[PDB]
RNA sequence: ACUCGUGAGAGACUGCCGGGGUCAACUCGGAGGAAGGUGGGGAUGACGUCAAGUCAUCAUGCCCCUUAUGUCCAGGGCUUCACACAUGCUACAAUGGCCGGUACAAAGGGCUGCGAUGCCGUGAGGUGGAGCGAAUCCUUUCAAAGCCGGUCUCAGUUCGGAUCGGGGUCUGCAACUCGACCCCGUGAAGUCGGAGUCGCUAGUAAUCGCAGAUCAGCAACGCUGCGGUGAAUACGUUCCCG
C-alpha cells in the first residue's frame, strides 16, 4: 500500500512485544478478580498511561510483502490476490485447485 | 413522472436540465413508465473529443429502454440522449397502430 | 511400543516413507502393525479471481494432509538407532512418541 | 372484576388476565400469582371478593402500576429532555433515541410516511 | 453367519439375519421405538412382502449416518441383500421390484456464485 | 456500558485538574478534550469546556447528569433540516 | 420437453386404503415435505367422512372426484398471429389432477377451523354436488361451451 | 468378522441381442450390472468483442507536490436524512404459538487457542482448570425441523416483534457520536401485498439446523461449505428474451 503504513504496522508489533508482553497483561490480571483491590490500585489508570500502541487491538494483519490490508489469510500471511498467483505457480507446498 | 439523475464530477446545472428534458417523454411512452433514471459522467482525459457521457434507463411497463450518448458538454449530451430515447420509444410502441402493418393480411 | 506418525502433503511420498520405514524396522527384526492409513485432513480456501470487484467469480484451493501410523513392538536399541539414522524426503515429517 | 381500577377480561386465565394491568406483564403475573397462592389456570369469573382484596393489597404493597407508573415514566422522559442530553433533543423531534438508523427506516418514531 | 450392508445418501446400515421370528433389533430398539412412521415400515418390509418370507427372520441392525429416511432406505437395501444371500433363486422377483439397486441420489455439491446448488441470485434487469 | 469490576473510567488529566480545582472550593472554567470521561460526583459544581470537533462547549454539571459521559453534552453533528 | 415427453413417476399405493388416489391426494396436500402431517390430515378427513356418512371413504371420494372431474377446458392458442380461447378436450390424467387440485385449494379457503374438518366438509359437499369445486367445474364447462365457435382449430 | 479410515485394482467400453437405418454415422427397445448410453456434480472459458473494471493488491510511461498533495498525533467523519432504488431477514399465524418429554447428520476449527467436571448467578456470564497440536480432549455425549403429551381457540390475539424506559455481562486504554449479548417492562406497522417482475426440472424448489474465513469484540439477517425432511409440473415451440 503505502511504505509509511507498512512500516508503522511493524513498529506497532515491536511495541506490542515490548509492552503488551508483561506490562499490559499484569494489569488485566489485577482487574480480573473482584477480590483483587483494583480501585485504589489504579491498575486501570496505570494501564491508561501506557501507550496506545502497546495494545494489540491496534494491530492489523497486512500482506507480508504486498501491504494489502484486506482479504488477508492467516495460514499464509498473504493477500487473496497474492495467494492466487503463487499457488498457481506452485510456490505454496501442498496447494492446488479444488474439485468435488 | 419522476426522474433520478446520478451525476458525477463537476456538472453544474446538468441535473436540472436533464430532469426537465427527460421528463417530457412520459407522454411519448404509450404505457406507464416506472423509475426512470439518468446518469451523467465526464471523461478525465482531455484527449477525448466528446468527453461527456450520458446514459438513460426507463422501465416502460416492464420493458427496459436504455440509451447512451457522448457529447462535448452537458446540454448537447442531454439533447442527443433525448433524441435517442425518443427514437427507442417510437420503436417500442407495440400498440395496435404500430403493430397493424405486420399482422398477416389477405 | 512407540507410535511413528507420518504426515505428508504427497500421497506417493507418504507411501514411500511408510514402505522403507517398515523395511528397515523389519530389517532390524521388529514386529510391525503395518502402514495404517488415517483420514486425510482437508483445508479449503475460497478467493476472488479479480483484483477489483467481480465478486461472483471465485477460485477454490485446498491443502491435503495424508497420515500414516506405524506401530512396532520389542523396541531393541538396534532398531532405535536405525530409526534415528534414516534420511527422509522433506515432504514427509516424522513424529516419534 | 375491578382490580386497581382496571376491569379484568370476561374469561381469561388468571396470569394472562393480570397481564392487562399496565404494570404487569407475564413474568410478573406468574410470580405474583405463585406468591399470593391463587391458582393460575382459574378463570376471571370465579374470583371471590377476598381474592380481589388479596391481589389488591399485594399489588399496592410490592408493585407500582397504572397511573403512578405512567406519570413516573413521563416525568423521567421530560427530565431527560430538559437537561439537554442527546436523548433529550432526540425525544424532542420524535426520532429514535437508541442509535437506530434513520436514513431509510425509523417510521415508528417518524409516524406514517409523508410525501414531498 | 451372514452379514450385509446398505447405503443410502450418507446412511449406512449393517444387517445380520437369523432364522428367528419377525423381530427387529435396530441398535437395541424395536421397529416401533425406532422408525415411528408407517411409510418407513412399509419401505422396510416391502422386500419381505414381495418375497412372502415375512415373520420368519430375526434381524439385527447397526445404523449410522443420515436421517430416518436415508436409514430406512439403507436398511431396506440391506434386507434385500440379506434375502438374496439366503435364497438366490428369487432374484427376479426382487430385482424386478428394484430393491437390489443402490440409489445414487446424493446431495448435489453447492456451487460458488449461487445461493444453493441450483438457485441463482435474483437478477433485476433494472 | 463499562463493567462494574473495572470501576468508572475517568481520565487522569481532568482528574488531577478537578482535585486541584476543588481543593480551594473555587470552580473556574476547565477546558478538556476527553469526551470519554464519565461524570463523577466530584464534578457537581465544576463547569467543563468539552471538545466538540470544532470548538469547546461549556457544560455545567448537576446532580441529575452524574453517571453519564461528557460527550453526551457536546453534540457533534449539526443538522437543521432540508 | 423440447426433445420429447418426460417419464412419469410411479407413485405407490396407500397402506391403510390401498388406492392410488389417496396417495395422489396426500401428495397434493403436502407442504414443505411434511409428509407425516399431510397423511394425518388426509386420514383424519377420510375418517370424519366415514363417521358422517357411514360408508367407505374411497367410494364417496371417487363420487366427489367424478362430480368435480372436468372434460372440456379453455386454452389460449395463437393461430395466424392472433390469440383465441379455444376449448380443448382434457386427458383423463389432467382431469384427475385438476379435480384433486381444485378440491385441495377450495378446502383450504373454507371456514371450518381446521384442515381436517375443512377437507372433510369439502369432499362431502363434492360427493353431494354442493362443493365450490363443483361450481368451478360448472364455470369452466360453461366457458368451454361459450367459446365452442373456436373449436375448429 | 461387518462399517469406517486410505493405498492398489476391477468395473461402462453401444461390450451383447433384436429393429430401424446407404449396412454408414447414428438412433429405438431389451438382457446383464451398482451404474447404459458425454451415470451425477466440479476444475478446465477458442480467435476476439464491449477503448468493460482495476494507476487504491502490485508494477508502470508521462504530468504534478516537495517546507508540501510527504510524514507524526488528538478529536471527529466514513454510521449524517424531507425522500428514491436495490438486495435480504422477520412476520401477518392453527400445515401455528407456548410448555414438558424424547430420536436421528455431515463437514469444520482449536496453544498463549479449544477449553470439560464442579461451584456461583434467572441469564448473558464469573471462578476454576481436567484433557488436548488433537479419528483420542474440547466444540458438549453434538443439532433443529421431526415424533408424543398438555394448553391456547381465530382475536391485531398466548401472532408479530419494531420502538422506547430501567437494570447488567463480555471484549477493548476507551462501547456518547458508534458493539454484541442478557434480564424486567413497553407492545408499532403488519389481515398475504397494484402495475409489473424473479428463481427453480429431482435429492431440485421449499423449509430446518451446523461449521468456517475475516475477527480483541462484533453491525453476520452477508459470504463460503455441510448435512435433516423433501414436492408439483413439462401437453408443445405460436408468442416474449438470448
Swiss-Prot record, chain A:
Q: Quote any Pfam family the record assigns.
A: Ribosomal_S14
Tell me which Gene Ontology terms the entry assigns under biological process: translation
This protein's UniProt keywords: Ribonucleoprotein, Ribosomal protein, RNA-binding, rRNA-binding
For the keyword Protein transport, the answer is no
Q: Which GO terms describe its molecular function?
A: rRNA binding; structural constituent of ribosome
Query: What are the GO cellular component annotations?
Result: small ribosomal subunit
User: Is the Repressor keyword given for this protein?
Assistant: no
Q: List the disulfide bonds.
A: none
What is the documented function of this protein?
A: Binds 16S rRNA, required for the assembly of 30S particles and may also be responsible for determining the conformation of the 16S rRNA at the A site.
What is its quaternary makeup?
Answer: Part of the 30S ribosomal subunit. Contacts proteins S3 and S10.
For this chain, the family text in UniProt reads:
Belongs to the universal ribosomal protein uS14 family.
The protein in question is named Small ribosomal subunit protein uS14A
Q: Name the gene behind this protein.
A: rpsN
UniProtKB/Swiss-Prot annotation, chain C:
Binding partners and assembly = Part of the 30S ribosomal subunit.
The gene for this chain is rpsJ
Q: Which Gene3D superfamilies match?
A: Ribosomal protein S10 domain
Give the matching SMART domains.
Answer: Ribosomal_S10 (SM01403)
Alphabetized UniProt keyword annotations: Ribonucleoprotein, Ribosomal protein
Q: Does the keyword Ribonucleoprotein apply?
A: yes
Q: Which Pfam families match?
A: Ribosomal_S10 (PF00338)
Q: What does this protein do?
A: Involved in the binding of tRNA to the ribosomes.
Write out the GO cellular component annotations: ribonucleoprotein complex; ribosome
Task: List, alphabetically, the InterPro entries matched.
Answer: Ribosomal_uS10 (IPR001848), Ribosomal_uS10_CS (IPR018268), Ribosomal_uS10_dom (IPR027486), Ribosomal_uS10_dom_sf (IPR036838)
Family, per the entry?
Belongs to the universal ribosomal protein uS10 family.
Keyword Ribonucleoprotein on entry:
yes
The protein's name = Small ribosomal subunit protein uS10
Task: Give the record's GO biological process terms.
Answer: translation
Look up and give the organism this protein is from. Answer: Mycolicibacterium smegmatis (strain ATCC 700084 / mc(2)155)
Q: GO molecular function of the protein, one example?
A: structural constituent of ribosome
Swiss-Prot record, chain E:
Gene Ontology BP terms:
translation
Name the domain of life. Answer: Bacteria
GO MF annotations, alphabetized: RNA binding; structural constituent of ribosome
- Signal peptide feature range: none
GO CC, sorted alphabetically, is:
cytoplasm; small ribosomal subunit
Please give the first and last residues shown and the length of the full protein: 25 to 150 of 150
Q: Provide the alphabetized UniProt keywords.
A: Ribonucleoprotein, Ribosomal protein
Official protein name in the record: Small ribosomal subunit protein uS9
What is the organism of origin for this protein?
Mycolicibacterium smegmatis (strain ATCC 700084 / mc(2)155) (Mycobacterium smegmatis)
Q: Which family does it belong to?
A: Belongs to the universal ribosomal protein uS9 family.
UniProtKB/Swiss-Prot annotation, chain F:
Please provide, alphabetically and separated by semicolons, the GO molecular function terms listed in this UniProt record: rRNA binding; structural constituent of ribosome
Q: What are the GO BP annotations of this UniProt entry?
A: ribosomal small subunit assembly; translation
Listed as disulfide-bonded, the cysteine pairs are none
* Swiss-Prot/TrEMBL keywords: Ribonucleoprotein, Ribosomal protein, RNA-binding, rRNA-binding
Cellular component terms (Gene Ontology): cytoplasm; small ribosomal subunit
Record keyword Protein transport present: no
Matches recorded under Gene3D superfamilies:
30s Ribosomal Protein S19, Chain A
Alphabetical list of HAMAP family matching this protein: Ribosomal_uS19 (MF_00531)
Q: Which family is annotated?
A: Belongs to the universal ribosomal protein uS19 family.
- What role does it play? Protein S19 forms a complex with S13 that binds strongly to the 16S ribosomal RNA.
Q: Could you identify this protein by its name?
A: Small ribosomal subunit protein uS19
Gene expressing this chain = rpsS
Amino acid at each position: 500500500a503505502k511504505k509509511s503504513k507498512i512500516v508503522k504496522n511493524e513498529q506497532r508489533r515491536e511495541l506490542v512485544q515490548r509492552y503488551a508482553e508483561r506490562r499490559a497483561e499484569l494489569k488485566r490480571t489485577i482487574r480480573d478478580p473482584a477480590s483483587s483491590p483494583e480501585r485504589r490500585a489504579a491498575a486501570v489508570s496505570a494501564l491508561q498511561r501506557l501507550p496506545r500502541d502497546s495494545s494489540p487491538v491496534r494491530l492489523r494483519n497486512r500482506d507480508v510483502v504486498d501491504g494489502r490490508p484486506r482479504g488477508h489469510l492467516r495460514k499464509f500471511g498473504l493477500s487473496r490476490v497474492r495467494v492466487r498467483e503463487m499457488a498457481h505457480r506452485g510456490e505454496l507446498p501442498g496447494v492446488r485447485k479444488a474439485s468435488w | 413522472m419522476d426522474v433520478d439523475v446520478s451525476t458525477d464530477g463537476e456538472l453544474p446545472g446538468a441535473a436540472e436540465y436533464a430532469r426537465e428534458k427527460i421528463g417530457r417523454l412520459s407522454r411519448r411512452a404509450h404505457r406507464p413508465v416506472l423509475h426512470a433514471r439518468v446518469r451523467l459522467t465526464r471523461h478525465g482525459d482531455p484527449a477525448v473529443e466528446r468527453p461527456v457521457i450520458a446514459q438513460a434507463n426507463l422501465d416502460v411497463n416492464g420493458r427496459q429502454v436504455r440509451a447512451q450518448v457522448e457529447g462535448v458538454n452537458a446540454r448537447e449530451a442531454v439533447d442527443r440522449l433525448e433524441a435517442r430515447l425518443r427514437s427507442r420509444l417510437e420503436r417500442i410502441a407495440e400498440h395496435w397502430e404500430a403493430r397493424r402493418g405486420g399482422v398477416p393480411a389477405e | 511400543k512407540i507410535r511413528i506418525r507420518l504426515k505428508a502433503y504427497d500421497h506417493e511420498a507418504i507411501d514411500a516413507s511408510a514402505r522403507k520405514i517398515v523395511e528397515t524396522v523389519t530389517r532390524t527384526g521388529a514386529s510391525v502393525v503395518g502402514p495404517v492409513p488415517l483420514p486425510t485432513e482437508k483445508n479449503v480456501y475460497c478467493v476472488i479471481r479479480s483484483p477489483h470487484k467481480y465478486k461472483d467469480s471465485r477460485e477454490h484451493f485446498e491443502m491435503r494432509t495424508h497420515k500414516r501410523l506405524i506401530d512396532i513392538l520389542d523396541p531393541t536399541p538396534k532398531t532405535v538407532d536405525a530409526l534415528m539414522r534414516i534420511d527422509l524426503p522433506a515432504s514427509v515429517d516424522v513424529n516419534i512418541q | 372484576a375491578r382490580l386497581v381500577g382496571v376491569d379484568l377480561p370476561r374469561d381469561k386465565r388468571m396470569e394472562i388476565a393480570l397481564t392487562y394491568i399496565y404494570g404487569i406483564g407475564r413474568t410478573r403475573s406468574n410470580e405474583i400469582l405463585a406468591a399470593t397462592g391463587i391458582d393460575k389456570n382459574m378463570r376471571t369469573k370465579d374470583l371471590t371478593d377476598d381474592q380481589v382484596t388479596v391481589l389488591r393489597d399485594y399489588i399496592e404493597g410490592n408493585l407500582k402500576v397504572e397511573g403512578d407508573l405512567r406519570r413516573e415514566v413521563q416525568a423521567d422522559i421530560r427530565r431527560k429532555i430538559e437537561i439537554g442530553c442527546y436523548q433529550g433533543l432526540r425525544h424532542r423531534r420524535g426520532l429514535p433515541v437508541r442509535g437506530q438508523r434513520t436514513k431509510t427506516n425509523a417510521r415508528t418514531r417518524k409516524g406514517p410516511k409523508r410525501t414531498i | 453367519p451372514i452379514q450385509t450392508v446398505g447405503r443410502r445418501k450418507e446412511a449406512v446400515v449393517r444387517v445380520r439375519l437369523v432364522p428367528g421370528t419377525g423381530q427387529f433389533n435396530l441398535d437395541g430398539r424395536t421397529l416401533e421405538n425406532y422408525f415411528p412412521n408407517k411409510v418407513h415400515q412399509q419401505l422396510i418390509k416391502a422386500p419381505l412382502v414381495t418375497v412372502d418370507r415375512v415373520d420368519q427372520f430375526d434381524i439385527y441392525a447397526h445404523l449410522d449416518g443420515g436421517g430416518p429416511s436415508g436409514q430406512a432406505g439403507a436398511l431396506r437395501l440391506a434386507i434385500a441383500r440379506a434375502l438374496i444371500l439366503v435364497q438366490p433363486e428369487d432374484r427376479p422377483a426382487l430385482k424386478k421390484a428394484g430393491f437390489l439397486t443402490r440409489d445414487p441420489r446424493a446431495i448435489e455439491r453447492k456451487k460458488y456464485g449461487l445461493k444453493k446448488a441450483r438457485k441463482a441470485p435474483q437478477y433485476s434487469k433494472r | 456500558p463499562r463493567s462494574l469490576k473495572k470501576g468508572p473510567f475517568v481520565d487522569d488529566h481532568l482528574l488531577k485538574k478537578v482535585d486541584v480545582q476543588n481543593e480551594k472550593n473555587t470552580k473556574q472554567v476547565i477546558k478538556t478534550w476527553s469526551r470519554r470521561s464519565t461524570i463523577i460526583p466530584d464534578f457537581i459544581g465544576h463547569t467543563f469546556a468539552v471538545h466538540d470537533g470544532r470548538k469547546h462547549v461549556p457544560v455545567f454539571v448537576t446532580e441529575a447528569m452524574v453517571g453519564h459521559k461528557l460527550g453526551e453534552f457536546a453534540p457533534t453533528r449539526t443538522f437543521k433540516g432540508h | 420437453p423440447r426433445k420429447g415427453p418426460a417419464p412419469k413417476r410411479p407413485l405407490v399405493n396407500d397402506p391403510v386404503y390401498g388406492s392410488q388416489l389417496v396417495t395422489q391426494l396426500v401428495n397434493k396436500v403436502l407442504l414443505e415435505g411434511k409428509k407425516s402431517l399431510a397423511e394425518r390430515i388426509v386420514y383424519g378427513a377420510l375418517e370424519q367422512a366415514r363417521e358422517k356418512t357411514g360408508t367407505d371413504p374411497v367410494v364417496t371420494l371417487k363420487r366427489a372426484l367424478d362430480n368435480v372431474k372436468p372434460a372440456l377446458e379453455v386454452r389460449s392458442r395463437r393461430v395466424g398471429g392472433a390469440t383465441y380461447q379455444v376449448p380443448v378436450e382434457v386427458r383423463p390424467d389432467r382431469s384427475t389432477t385438476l379435480a384433486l387440485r381444485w378440491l385441495v385449494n377450495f378446502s383450504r379457503q373454507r371456514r371450518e377451523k381446521t384442515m381436517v374438518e375443512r377437507l372433510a366438509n369439502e369432499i362431502l359437499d363434492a360427493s353431494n354436488g354442493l362443493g365450490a369445486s363443483v361450481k368451478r367445474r360448472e364455470d369452466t364447462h360453461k366457458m368451454a361451451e361459450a367459446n365452442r365457435a373456436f373449436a375448429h382449430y
